[PDB]
Amino acid sequence: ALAEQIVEFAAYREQLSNYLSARMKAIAPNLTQLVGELVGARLIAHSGSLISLAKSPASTIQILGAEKALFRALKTKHDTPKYGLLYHASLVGQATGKNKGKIARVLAAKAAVSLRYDALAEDRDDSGDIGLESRAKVENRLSQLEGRDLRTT
Amino acid sequence: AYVLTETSAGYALLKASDKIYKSSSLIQDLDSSDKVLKEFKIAAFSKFNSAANALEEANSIIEGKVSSQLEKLLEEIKKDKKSTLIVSETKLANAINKLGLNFNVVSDAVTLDIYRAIKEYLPELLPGMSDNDLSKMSLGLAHSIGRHKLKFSADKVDVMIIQAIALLDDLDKELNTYAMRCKEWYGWHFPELAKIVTDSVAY
Amino acid sequence: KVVIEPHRHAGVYIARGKEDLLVTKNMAPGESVYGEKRISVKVEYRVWNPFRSKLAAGIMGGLDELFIAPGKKVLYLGAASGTSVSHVSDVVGPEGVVYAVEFSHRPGRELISMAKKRPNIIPIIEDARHPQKYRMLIGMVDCVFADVAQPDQARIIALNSHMFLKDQGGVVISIKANCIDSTVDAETVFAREVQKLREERIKPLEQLTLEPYERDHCIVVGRYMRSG
Amino acid sequence: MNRKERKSTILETLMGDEASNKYFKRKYNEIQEKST
Amino acid sequence: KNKGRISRYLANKCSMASRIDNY
Amino acid sequence: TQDSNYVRTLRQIELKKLEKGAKQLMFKSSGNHTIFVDSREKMNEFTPEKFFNTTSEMVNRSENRLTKDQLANASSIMPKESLDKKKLKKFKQVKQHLQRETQLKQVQQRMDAQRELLKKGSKKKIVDSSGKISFKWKKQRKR
Amino acid sequence: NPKAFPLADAALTQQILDVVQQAANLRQLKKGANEATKTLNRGISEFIIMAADCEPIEILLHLPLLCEDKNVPYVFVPSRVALGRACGVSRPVIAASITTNDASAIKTQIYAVKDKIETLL
Amino acid sequence: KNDNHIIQAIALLDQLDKDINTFAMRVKEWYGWHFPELAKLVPDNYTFAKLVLFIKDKASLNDDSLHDLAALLNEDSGIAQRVIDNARISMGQDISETDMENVCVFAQRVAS
RNA sequence: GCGAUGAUCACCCAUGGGUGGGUACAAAUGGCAGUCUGACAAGU
């Protein structure tokens, strides 16, 4: 009966994750087109309200996760952390190193723009246009940065 | 004369002795009281039904147009070919002028005396038709009208999504600890299985 | 450790402890609606903030007759984000009822959240300029307060008082010369709006300028006599 | 030991220990008088 | 006082019962 | 020795400390409260004692003007010297937060001045006759 | 009434863009919407100029809210290309922020447009 | 002579009671968003989960609803008539059908 | 009509309460607690 409880918990948690994907696509569809449902809901849970996240600027979104290392390093004069919460996005996962840093910058900035559109669009067609076009922008910047190399040929 | 009145519990219609001169007598003799409301207690009342979305749309049609509840209230108001009725909305006044029963209506005239006094002594009208308190009724109806007047897409709730992701985190933690519990309990029969498999779900 | 002193108005108190504070009771225990701190003395109390709510600065500034009692009903016009309608709900308690009215959208959403928290708040997202649009929702208020930022303030209060106040009612208004004129003296501004209230039949008992807490702000308190 | 005395640093529990505190301040005043 | 006496009494009896239920 | 990052963190720290402190504080009012009287004889006999039905200290204190029918600090130790010292102490700590915040703003402004001067421009150093220093950047669109 | 709240006429817009160039010359203007939000958080933005022709109005409509929060007024320009041209930069800026500095010789000009801007609001 | 069954039974009963009250107050939040006066009317969390499972939505208030929700524990506490009147004049926020199915499955989880 | 299977061993007001303290859990929009930089980068 305990194992029955366990598999019921697992199936209900899977159904809950699907319901969360549906809820995030309903709330902020362009953010689902940009960064991902899970990390978008994580930024929402960090900031509190979506209007508060729209009020937050781009650097706050970039270092929303690692506030501990942020305030620590700014206090004791070290390198500021550069990923925070949005490292777990599939794009920053596909990037590498200072490519991860620059894609973290441009992705935080583009996510701030399209998140402000999603949060302040009184009318909104819920299609995914702004998120798709900004994602194509980040894809083009990523391909350009990957094509730019470092060692001399 | 008739007086059409809107309340959070229903639609109340009053007879008065033939009006403007009745409003004047009210204001000059201070008729905010139970005596005047028993001179004009009730003439024709209608409850609306117990459907929250329906009564919300009903107040929206009160704000904009004329409705079928107003028809089923307004089916037998007239006695002769000419019947007068007092309202406080001008667009609603002309709307029930161009309405089919074509009885003559007065717009927002000096009968703020009438409307304000019967709204003051509306507690005396409560033993007439509405034997309850209308405070929580106005509470719920005002909440519904506000909920519709702001757009309120019912799928976009930030406190719902934040409670949902929090409960997802709690269910993950609870699944992990009950997994460890059943794993150590089933170590009584299978420690080798408990070490060779790692999934809680497969366990 | 913290003595409570009941103020001359029913529903407001003063905390004398390590710091002096102007306080009220609480309706949602352990729920600060806008970030202000709460004290436990036990009975739960929440302090008022004058700069955020000039209504707190007025009773602190000196007020003879405040027409908002526990067993009464108060209309609030210009209820931006509710930081004062929560406090007037606390000062009227369960017996009293406050009708908050606000037109704008996002303070309107904050006000719906606060009306979800507190049943004493009744929400009106309907516009304040046309009272017949929400004449169904509010009935025969005892006192009215205005915090609206529109130049036709005494006129819109005249409409709301004619249509919604009881006779011998209460009219309390916040008036801003920087909003209505912004070029002429505050004293002749206040004299002119007193003359406007006199033309609109409000008999003004008093007025108080809010100099240490805000800048060029006035509150006026008057009776509503001889209206049907 | 306690809960309202369970603190995250052994230096901090040394400052919470008061006999060591007065012992330290006494001997510290002693040796600073010897120094000055 | 006698609460502690009752506690010590029951502690001795529960010790003996733990002994017999163990062996 | 110190940099803009650490002093900006300190700036936000102490500004939020000032905000919490000033939210905690209490300021006595001072306004031109006027009462509007119907008749001139009632003006001539108008007394704040009868109008406010108060006492002398009750009418001098604009906060607590309690009615005489409502009339009809010793709980804490050392009332006359220690509680007032505690209130005034909190007030001085708020003032010292203000002073350290303004001094730190001066530090940050001088550091940003040096940072911009080292950062960028085709500059001309100008001295103003009060012994002061300034830099005139040449008028040019940065690409 | 669109969401495009205060948008000046031609002559007013001209003159604020001229204070924009003079403050960019005296290093009294900061550039970008995210940076404008940053100095709003800083409490040193004295007022805000924004665009109207952006992709879309919303990413800069997030700024008037914090403007009414931190009593720092704002206005709109029709052309963000014109705003970046008065910023003096190759790319069209959509949001720029006039800061505060007490030893600024153009402060009478800024306090003048402050009067005119408050009478517009 | 084995006793870890007793030991893990104590530990699992403690964790189980804790998870009962946590998940049941979470049911209480998730249906107080739709009907907070249910959380003010019925304080028992188990009967709250059962009552959520029965009253999925506060719109279906019938005489047979009075009957079966009174068979739900009782009539004498006034809970049936009071909750029908309060769900008739409720100010609660309407939610979607996916949220509704989620809350009912969560109350069923609490009951099981 | 005993006992090793175990004898015996902080205040105030007069066998009642307040203070003080310790034990486990839950909530906090309670405190620690403060949200990085900003015009150039790459090929020719």
UniProtKB/Swiss-Prot annotation, chain A:
This is Nucleolar protein 58. The gene is NOP58. Belongs to the NOP5/NOP56 family. It comes from Saccharomyces cerevisiae (strain ATCC 204508 / S288c) (Baker's yeast). Required for pre-18S rRNA processing. May bind microtubules. Interacts with SIK1/NOP56 and NOP1. Interacts with the trimethylguanosine synthase TGS1. Component of the ribosomal small subunit (SSU) processome composed of at least 40 protein subunits and snoRNA U3. There is a cross-link at K25 (Glycyl lysine isopeptide (Lys-Gly) (interchain with G-Cter in ubiquitin)). Present with 34700 molecules/cell in log phase SD medium. The chain holds residues 257 to 409 of 511 of the full protein. It is found in: Nucleus, Nucleolus. The lineage of its organism: Eukaryota, Fungi, Dikarya, Ascomycota, Saccharomycotina. Residues 27-147 form the Nop domain.
Curated annotation (Swiss-Prot), chain F:
Keywords: Nucleus, Ribonucleoprotein, Ribosome biogenesis, rRNA processing. The keyword Protein biosynthesis does not apply. GO terms for cellular component: nucleolus; nucleoplasm; small-subunit processome; sno(s)RNA-containing ribonucleoprotein complex. It is found in: Nucleus, Nucleolus. The keyword Transmembrane does not apply. One of its GO terms (biological process) is endonucleolytic cleavage to generate mature 5'-end of SSU-rRNA from (SSU-rRNA, 5.8S rRNA, LSU-rRNA). Residues 112-143 are annotated as: Disordered. Its main location: nucleus. It comes from the Eukaryota. Component of the ribosomal small subunit (SSU) processome composed of at least 40 protein subunits and snoRNA U3. Interacts with snoRNA U3. Interacts with EBP2, FAF1, MPP10, RPS16A and RRP14. Belongs to the UTP11 family. Involved in nucleolar processing of pre-18S ribosomal RNA. This is U3 small nucleolar RNA-associated protein 11. It comes from Saccharomyces cerevisiae (strain ATCC 204508 / S288c) (Baker's yeast). The gene is UTP11.
From Swiss-Prot, chain G:
Keywords: mRNA processing, mRNA splicing, Nucleus, Ribonucleoprotein, Ribosome biogenesis, RNA-binding, rRNA processing, Spliceosome. PROSITE patterns: RIBOSOMAL_L7AE. One of its GO terms (biological process) is maturation of SSU-rRNA from tricistronic rRNA transcript (SSU-rRNA, 5.8S rRNA, LSU-rRNA). InterPro entries: eL8/uL1-like, H/ACA_rnp_Nhp2-like, Ribosomal_eL30-like_sf, Ribosomal_eL8-like_CS, Ribosomal_eL8/eL30/eS12/Gad45, Ribosomal_eL8/Nhp2. The keyword Chaperone does not apply. Gene3D superfamilies: 3.30.1330.30. One of its GO terms (cellular component) is U4/U6 snRNP. CDD domains: SNU13 (cd21104). It is found in: Nucleus, Nucleolus. The keyword Phosphoprotein does not apply. Changing R80A: Impairs binding to U4 snRNA, but not U3 snoRNA, and causes pre rRNA processing defects and an accumulation of unspliced U3 snoRNA. One of its GO terms (molecular function) is RNA binding. Changing E55A: Impairs binding to U4 snRNA, but not U3 snoRNA. Causes pre-mRNA splicing and pre-rRNA processing defects. Belongs to the eukaryotic ribosomal protein eL8 family. Binds to the C'/D and B/C motifs in U3 snoRNA. Component of the U4/U6-U5 tri-snRNP complex composed of the U4, U6 and U5 snRNAs and at least PRP3, PRP4, PRP6, PRP8, PRP18, PRP31, PRP38, SNU13, SNU23, SNU66, SNU114, SPP381, SMB1, SMD1, SMD2, SMD3, SMX2, SMX3, LSM2, LSM3, LSM4, LSM5, LSM6, LSM7, LSM8, BRR2 and DIB1. Binds to the 5'-stem-loop of U4 snRNA. Component of the ribosomal small subunit (SSU) processome composed of at least 40 protein subunits and snoRNA U3. This is 13 kDa ribonucleoprotein-associated protein.
Swiss-Prot record, chain H:
Keywords: Nucleus, Phosphoprotein, Ribonucleoprotein, Ribosome biogenesis. One of its GO terms (cellular component) is nucleoplasm. Its main location: nucleus. It comes from the Eukaryota. It is found in: Nucleus, Nucleolus. GO terms for biological process: box C/D sno(s)RNA 3'-end processing; maturation of SSU-rRNA; rRNA modification; rRNA processing; snoRNA guided rRNA 2'-O-methylation. GO terms for molecular function: mRNA binding; snoRNA binding. The keyword Hydrolase does not apply. Interacts with NOP1 and NOP58. Component of the ribosomal small subunit (SSU) processome composed of at least 40 protein subunits and snoRNA U3. Belongs to the NOP5/NOP56 family. Required for 60S ribosomal subunit synthesis. Present with 13500 molecules/cell in log phase SD medium. This is Nucleolar protein 56. It comes from Saccharomyces cerevisiae (strain ATCC 204508 / S288c).
